[PDB]
Design an enzyme around this catalytic site. Structure first.
Site, PDB file in Angstrom:
ATOM      1  N   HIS A 120       0.838  -1.186   0.000  1.00 18.23           N
ATOM      2  CA  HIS A 120       0.000   0.000   0.000  1.00 18.23           C
ATOM      3  C   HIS A 120       0.884   1.251   0.000  1.00 18.23           C
ATOM      4  CE1 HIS A 120      -4.292   1.380   0.830  1.00 18.23           C
ATOM      5  NE2 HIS A 120      -3.595   2.498   0.727  1.00 18.23           N
ATOM      6  N   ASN A 166      -2.287  -2.079  -3.910  1.00 22.70           N
ATOM      7  CA  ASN A 166      -3.367  -1.104  -3.817  1.00 22.70           C
ATOM      8  C   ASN A 166      -3.102   0.047  -4.781  1.00 22.70           C
ATOM      9  OD1 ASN A 166      -5.722   0.213  -2.050  1.00 22.70           O
ATOM     10  ND2 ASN A 166      -4.116   1.755  -2.350  1.00 22.70           N
ATOM     11  N   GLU A 167      -4.055   0.291  -5.687  1.00 24.61           N
ATOM     12  CA  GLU A 167      -4.043   1.405  -6.634  1.00 24.61           C
ATOM     13  C   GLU A 167      -2.693   1.552  -7.330  1.00 24.61           C
ATOM     14  OE1 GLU A 167      -5.636   4.997  -4.974  1.00 24.61           O
ATOM     15  OE2 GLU A 167      -7.332   3.972  -4.042  1.00 24.61           O
ATOM     16  N   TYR A 311     -14.411   6.255  -5.805  1.00 23.27           N
ATOM     17  CA  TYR A 311     -14.812   7.435  -5.047  1.00 23.27           C
ATOM     18  C   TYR A 311     -15.659   8.414  -5.855  1.00 23.27           C
ATOM     19  CZ  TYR A 311     -11.531   5.932  -1.470  1.00 23.27           C
ATOM     20  OH  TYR A 311     -10.877   5.221  -0.495  1.00 23.27           O
ATOM     21  N   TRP A 429     -13.859   3.249   3.275  1.00 24.08           N
ATOM     22  CA  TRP A 429     -12.689   4.032   3.649  1.00 24.08           C
ATOM     23  C   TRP A 429     -13.132   5.294   4.383  1.00 24.08           C
ATOM     24  CZ3 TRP A 429      -7.675   2.883   3.698  1.00 24.08           C
ATOM     25  CH2 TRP A 429      -6.792   3.920   4.023  1.00 24.08           C
ATOM     26  N   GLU A 436      -3.975  11.532   4.975  1.00 25.35           N
ATOM     27  CA  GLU A 436      -4.331  11.483   3.556  1.00 25.35           C
ATOM     28  C   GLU A 436      -3.115  11.806   2.686  1.00 25.35           C
ATOM     29  OE1 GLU A 436      -6.872  10.894   0.213  1.00 25.35           O
ATOM     30  OE2 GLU A 436      -6.900  10.195   2.296  1.00 25.35           O
ATOM     31  N   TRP A 437      -2.039  11.052   2.916  1.00 23.85           N
ATOM     32  CA  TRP A 437      -0.799  11.093   2.129  1.00 23.85           C
ATOM     33  C   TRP A 437      -0.324  12.544   2.013  1.00 23.85           C
ATOM     34  CZ3 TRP A 437       1.195   6.503   2.158  1.00 23.85           C
ATOM     35  CH2 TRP A 437       0.367   5.372   2.159  1.00 23.85           C
TER      36      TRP A 437
END
Length: 475
Positions: A120, A166-167, A311, A429, A436-437
Site C-alpha cells: 500500500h 493497492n491502486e 470514489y 474508507w 491522507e498522504w
C-alpha cells in the site's frame, strides 16, 4: 434496495496512514518516510511518524469494529516492517512479523475476517536506493515475490483474503509522472526532481503488474489449495461519461481514459492479454512490452477477484492537437461539468471527490462486462463538506457521509439485480480519520473522528448506522 445475505462488508485502513511507530519494532524506512520528511515539506507539513498510533492502540480500534458490527477489516502490511531493507536476500524482522500476527489473532478473536493488502504505497527505501524500486522491473518483481511468499507462509493459515497491490495507477503516475507522491520523481514537477515523465510511469506500471503476477503464481501454485483462500488486486479509477454525449470523439475519449487507467492493469492480469491498443498506439516503445516470458507467468496463475477502489466520476472531453510525450491520462481533458453545465456529482469535503452514485452503477457494469470477475468494493468513502474545519462535536453528526454510503449501496444493489454484476463485498474508507498522504491530516475520511492532539477516537454517526443499513438491505 436489497443486498445478498452473504455480502461481506467492513472497514479499511492502510499501514503508513494509521500505524505510526515508524522506527519502532525493527521497522525500516519506506519511501514515504523519506518523502514526508522533505524540507520544505511537499506533504502539507504532515508525516506519518505517529499518524493515529494504531501500532499501540489496535485493541481500541478493533473494539470499534465490534461496536460497528463489521465482519471484515481490510488493512495493509508495512513491507519495511516485515523486511526492513525489502530485498529477497535481506534479513526478515521477526518482531514486525509478530506484530501483524498479533493483529490477525486480535481480529479473529473478535470474529472479524482479516483482509490483508501486501503493498500500500510504502516501498522500502532501500529498494529505491539500490536499483530504483519500481523502475527496475526485473529486480522489484523478484523482491515482491519473496515478500508475498513469506506472508503466505506466516499468515496464510489464518488469512484467507489477500490483496497484492493497492491502486497501482497512483503509484505509477503520482510517483513517477507527476512526482506528487513518493518517491517524487518527475520531469514536469515544479520542484527540481529527477525522473522522466515520458518513460518512468510506464516502467513502474509494468513492474507492479509482474509483481502481482509472480505473487498470484506463488499463491496459485503453493497456497490456494491448502489454505483455501483467495487473492486479488485493488484498482482505482473514476468512471467517465463523455463531456458531450453527441460528440463521438468524447464517447471514445471516455472509454480510452478508462482503458488507460484500469485496462492498463486489468488486461494482462484478468484477461491475460496485452495493454489496450489505445495505450500502445499513443506510447509506442515507451510502453515496456510484455514478453512471452511475462505472459507465461500471467498464464501460470489466476486472480480471484477484481478489487475496486471507487470514489468519484468525471466527464471526458476529446483532445485536439498533438499529444505531448509527457501525457499519461490518454489524450483527454477532464471535467466536472458536461456540455449542459450539469455537475458530475455533489460536492464533498475535498474538491476532487464528487458523489456520483448513478455513474458508479454503470462503472460496475462496465468492469463486469470487460473482465468477467467478481468484484469486492475494497474502498469507498468520503470526507464531508467543511469537515476539515469542523470540531469533533460538529463532525460526529455526518449525514453527508451517511447519504454517500446509502447512495453507493443503492448503485451496488442495482448493478447486482439489473446488470448481473457479482459484487460480493464492500469496505468503507476509512475506519478512522488518518493521514491522507501528501494532503496531510486535513481530509477526514473516517467513520471515526481522530483527535490528533490526544489520539482519542470518537465514533461518527455513520459508524453506528452502517450496520443497520446493511441489515435493512439484507432483510
Amino acid at each position: 434496495l436489497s443486498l445478498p445475505k452473504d455480502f461481506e462488508w467492513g472497514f479499511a485502513t492502510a499501514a503508513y496512514q494509521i500505524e505510526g511507530a515508524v522506527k519502532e519494532g525493527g521497522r525500516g524506512p519506506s519511501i514515504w518516510d523519506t518523502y514526508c520528511h522533505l524540507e520544505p515539506s511537499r506533504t502539507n507539513g504532515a508525516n506519518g511518524d505517529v499518524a493515529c498510533d494504531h501500532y499501540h492502540r489496535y485493541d481500541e480500534d478493533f473494539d470499534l469494529l465490534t461496536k460497528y458490527g463489521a465482519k471484515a477489516y481490510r488493512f495493509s502490511l508495512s513491507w519495511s516492517r516485515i523486511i526492513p531493507l525489502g530485498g529477497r536476500l535481506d534479513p526478515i524482522n521477526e518482531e514486525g512479523i509478530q506484530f501483524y500476527s498479533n493483529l490477525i489473532d486480535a481480529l479473529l478473536k473478535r470474529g472479524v475476517t482479516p483482509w490483508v493488502t501486501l503493498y500500500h504505497w510504502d516501498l522500502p527505501q532501500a529498494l529505491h536506493d539500490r536499483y530504483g524500486g519500481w523502475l527496475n522491473v526485473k529486480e522489484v518483481q523478484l523482491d515482491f515475490e519473496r515478500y508475498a511468499r513469506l506472508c503466505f507462509e506466516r499468515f496464510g493459515d489464518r488469512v484467507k483474503n489477500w490483496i497484492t497491490i493497492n491502486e497501482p495507477w497512483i503509484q505509477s503516475i503520482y510517483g513517477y509522472a507527476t512526482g506528487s507522491n513518493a518517491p517524487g520523481r518527475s520531469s514536469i514537477n515544479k520542484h527540481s526532481t529527477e525522473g522522466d515523465t515520458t518513460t518512468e510511469p510506464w516502467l513502474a506500471g509494468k513492474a507492479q503488474i509482474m509483481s502481482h503476477a509472480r505473487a498470484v503464481a506463488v499463491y496459485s501454485k503453493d497456497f490456494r489449495a491448502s489454505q483455501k483462500g483467495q487473492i486479488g488486486i485493488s484498482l482505482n479509477g473514476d468512471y467517465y461519461e463523455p463531456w458531450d454525449s453527441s460528440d463521438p470523439r468524447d464517447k471514445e475519449a471516455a472509454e480510452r481514459r478508462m482503458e488507460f487507467h484500469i485496462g492498463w492493469y486489468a488486461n494482462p492480469i484478468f484477461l491475460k492479454k496485452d495493454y489496450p491498443a489505445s495505450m500502445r498506439k499513443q506510447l509506442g516503445d515507451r510502453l515496456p512490452a510484455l514478453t512471452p516470458a511475462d505472459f507465461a507467468i500471467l498464464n501460470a496463475g489466476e486472480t480471484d477477484f477484481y478489487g475496486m477502489n471507487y470514489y468519484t466520476s468525471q466527464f471526458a472531453r476529446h483532445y485536439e492537437g498533438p499529444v505531448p510525450k509527457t501525457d499519461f491520462l490518454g489524450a483527454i481533458h477532464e471535467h466536472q461539468e458536461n456540455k449542459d453545465g450539469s455537475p458530475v456529482g455533489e460536492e464533498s469535503g475535498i474538491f476532487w471527490l464528487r458523489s456520483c452514485p448513478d455513474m458508479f452503477r454503470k462503472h460496475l457494469a462496465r468492469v463486469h462486462g470487460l473482465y468477467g470477475k467478481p468484484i469486492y468494493i475494497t474502498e469507498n468513502g468520503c470526507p464531508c463538506p467543511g469537515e476539515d474545519k469542523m470540531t469533533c462535536e460538529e463532525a460526529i453528526n455526518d449525514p453527508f457521509r451517511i447519504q454517500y454510503f446509502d447512495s453507493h449501496l443503492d448503485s451496488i444493489s442495482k448493478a447486482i439485480s439489473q446488470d448481473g454484476v457479482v459484487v460480493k463485498g464492500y469496505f468503507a474508507w476509512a475506519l478512522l480519520d488518518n493521514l491522507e498522504w501528501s494532503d496531510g491530516y486535513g481530509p477526514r475520511f473516517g467513520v471515526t473522528y481522530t483527535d490528533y492532539t490526544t489520539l482519542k477516537r470518537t465514533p461518527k454517526k455513520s459508524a453506528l448506522v452502517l450496520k443497520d443499513m446493511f441489515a435493512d438491505r439484507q432483510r
